[PDB]
Design an enzyme around this catalytic site. Structure first.
Site, PDB file in Angstrom:
ATOM      1  N   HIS A   1      59.110  17.685  35.448  1.00 47.26           N
ATOM      2  CA  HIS A   1      58.000  17.294  34.896  1.00 47.26           C
ATOM      3  C   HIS A   1      57.711  15.654  34.622  1.00 47.26           C
ATOM      4  CE1 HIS A   1      57.116  21.494  32.745  1.00 47.26           C
ATOM      5  NE2 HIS A   1      56.800  21.307  34.208  1.00 47.26           N
TER       6      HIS A   1
ATOM      7  N   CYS B   1      71.717  26.267  21.916  1.00 48.16           N
ATOM      8  CA  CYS B   1      72.586  25.753  22.908  1.00 48.16           C
ATOM      9  C   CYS B   1      73.654  24.790  22.708  1.00 48.16           C
ATOM     10  CB  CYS B   1      72.033  25.205  24.177  1.00 48.16           C
ATOM     11  SG  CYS B   1      71.186  23.734  24.294  1.00 48.16           S
TER      12      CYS B   1
HETATM   13  N1  LIG Z   1      49.230  24.590  33.177  1.00 49.22           N
HETATM   14  C1  LIG Z   1      50.628  24.972  32.603  1.00 49.22           C
HETATM   15  C2  LIG Z   1      51.174  23.850  32.183  1.00 49.22           C
HETATM   16  C3  LIG Z   1      52.376  23.719  31.429  1.00 49.22           C
HETATM   17  C4  LIG Z   1      52.788  24.974  30.793  1.00 49.22           C
HETATM   18  C5  LIG Z   1      54.300  25.049  30.409  1.00 49.22           C
HETATM   19  C6  LIG Z   1      54.645  23.475  30.059  1.00 49.22           C
HETATM   20  C7  LIG Z   1      54.651  25.908  30.085  1.00 49.22           C
HETATM   21  C8  LIG Z   1      53.834  27.406  30.371  1.00 49.22           C
HETATM   22  O1  LIG Z   1      54.741  28.216  30.122  1.00 49.22           O
HETATM   23  O2  LIG Z   1      52.958  27.394  31.285  1.00 49.22           O
HETATM   24  C9  LIG Z   1      52.322  26.416  31.480  1.00 49.22           C
HETATM   25  C10 LIG Z   1      51.180  26.247  32.130  1.00 49.22           C
END
Ligand SMILES: *Nc1ccc2c(C)cc(=O)oc2c1
Ligand SMILES: [Zn+2]
Length: 267
Positions: free
Chosen positions: A123, A258
């Site tokens: 990310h 953890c």
């Molecule tokens: N579009 C989207 C963006 C970020 C997400 C994260 C950080 C976790 C997730 O479980 O689903 C996401 C979906």
């Protein structure tokens, strides 16, 4: 799923290529705010409101305030024993000719601060910028990132927008560019860097042991990575706090912070 540390340790002793997928719980154990789940807000917003191209397009000052706060908070944060076990594992195994790679969704660089070198930040990072004109990616640890953001980004509800003119927000310093910078982090609704995913696929294809730490394995991001490892017959070991659920067609599940379980698992 087995919770036998001794059995896990037998696989670990013999493993020559470990993939460690690091999720948000590793950062949460260091007190890093994520602005995601229940209760997790910055002013009146959560990350899904601000970490989007549309938010940045309409109010780049507000999005920069949010990421400026998150940068500056890191001066009071330290890697935890989980980060340290992972870094110490990489260092020790590397002197034996054995590979450890950390694939993390976390953007706060605490794995790097702990000494991890083989790191895939899927990310991006709070401490990298990307120019919205020329695309150059740069490291940036400056406090503050630009003078207009000094003292800005306070998190308390009721804090007013700084409304910094876009010319005074962080700007590209490549000769002849001067464009507006954004944080080099993946936003909701965005693609992950295909070259990052190229490198991730190579590591998944070759590893002989996979750890999922601080996250669930049945959810993004680990759900994109662990199934095909397990399908190859590679053991998958999950280290997280939520009493299984997550349900696991994977080899091991160790419950707890953890920073409690990894120092022992990775000794
Ligand atoms: N579009 C989207 C963006 C970020 C997400 C994260 C950080 C976790 C997730 O479980 O689903 C996401 C979906
Ligand atoms: Zn530029």
């Amino acid at each position: 799923p087995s919770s036998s540390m001794a059995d896990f340790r037998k696989f670990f002793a013999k493993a020559k290529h470990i993939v460690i997928i690091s999720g948000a719980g590793v950062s949460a154990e260091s007190g890093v705010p994520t602005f995601r789940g229940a209760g997790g807000y910055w002013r009146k917003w959560q990350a899904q409101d601000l970490a989007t191209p549309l938010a940045f397009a309409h109010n780049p000052s507000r999005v920069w305030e949010f990421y400026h706060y998150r940068r500056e908070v890191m001066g009071s944060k330290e890697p935890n024993a989980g980060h340290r076990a992972i870094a110490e594992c990489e260092t020790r195994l590397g002197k034996q000719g054995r590979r450890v790679v950390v694939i993390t969704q976390n953007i706060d660089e605490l794995h790097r601060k702990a000494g991890t070198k083989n790191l895939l930040e899927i990310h991006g990072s709070l401490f990298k910028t990307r120019c919205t004109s020329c695309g150059v990616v740069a490291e940036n640890y400056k406090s503050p990132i630009c003078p207009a953001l000094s003292g800005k980004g306070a998190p308390e509800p009721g804090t007013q927008d700084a409304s910094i003119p876009v010319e005074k927000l962080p700007r590209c310093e490549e000769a002849g560019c001067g464009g507006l910078l954004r944080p080099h982090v993946v936003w909701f609704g965005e693609n992950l860097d295909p070259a990052i995913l190229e490198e991730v696929d190579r590591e998944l294809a070759h590893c002989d042991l996979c750890l999922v730490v601080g996250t669930s394995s049945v959810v993004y991001p680990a759900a994109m990575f662990a199934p095909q490892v397990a399908a190859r017959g590679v053991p998958v070991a999950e280290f997280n706090t939520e009493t299984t659920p997550a349900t696991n067609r994977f080899r091991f599940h160790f419950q707890g912070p953890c920073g409690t379980t990894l120092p022992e698992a990775l000794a």
